[PDB]
Design a protein around this ligand. Structure first.
Ligand SMILES: [Ca+2]
Ligand SMILES: [Ca+2]
Ligand SMILES: [Ca+2]
Ligand SMILES: [Ca+2]
Lengths: 109, 109
């Protein structure tokens, strides 16, 4: 579970800072939620939770559902915010986020 | 000037590595420019050059112009690049970069 990996108060603050439409910034979010403090192993555990269908990749729909991974009542990312995050992460043209790419997203936050 | 603290060759190469739109990556830039080699006193001296108006802080506009501090002909950071660097550096939420924050920006590169 996400709450075993990260502070509920950190998740609350991080989610709260991006309620406004089109405001999402993955680097600031991942920093605020405390993901930079996690071991490589825990970063991976986070990826697998966000990988809702366990395909081994975060596809677009799971990417838009990312905040719900951290707190279930959070908003979806808009189509545009998702395009932005996919562009930020998908550096190998696969059309989806591999584990390596999520690790990179977090380490570069 | 900056070239009394860092190498001309290093500056030219480091800036040339980020000619492209939205390509700036401060950690990679600080590595390339030779900043990780500097003593703590020289890193502080660097901060003071980048503090263009001598307010004792690097404000948003001065982040925009950070590269010009290294070489006067260098491009501005885009609004997006600037927001990113502010988010990374502004640990205390003061909305500008204090000297301690700059030292941390460099040390964590
Ligand atoms: Ca998936
Ligand atoms: Ca990919
Ligand atoms: Ca200033
Ligand atoms: Ca600050």
């Amino acid at each position: 579970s996400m709450t075993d990996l990260l502070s509920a108060e950190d998740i609350k603050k991080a989610i709260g800072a991006f309620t406004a439409a089109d405001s999402f910034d993955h680097k600031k979010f991942f920093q605020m939620v405390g993901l930079k403090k996690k071991s490589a192993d825990d970063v991976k555990k986070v990826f697998h939770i966000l990988d809702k269908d366990k395909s081994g990749f975060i596809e677009e729909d799971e990417l838009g559902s990312i905040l719900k991974g951290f707190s279930s009542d959070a908003r979806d990312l808009s189509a545009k915010e998702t395009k932005t995050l996919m562009a930020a992460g998908d550096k190998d043209g696969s059309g989806k986020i591999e584990v390596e790419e999520f690790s990179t997203l977090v380490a570069e936050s």
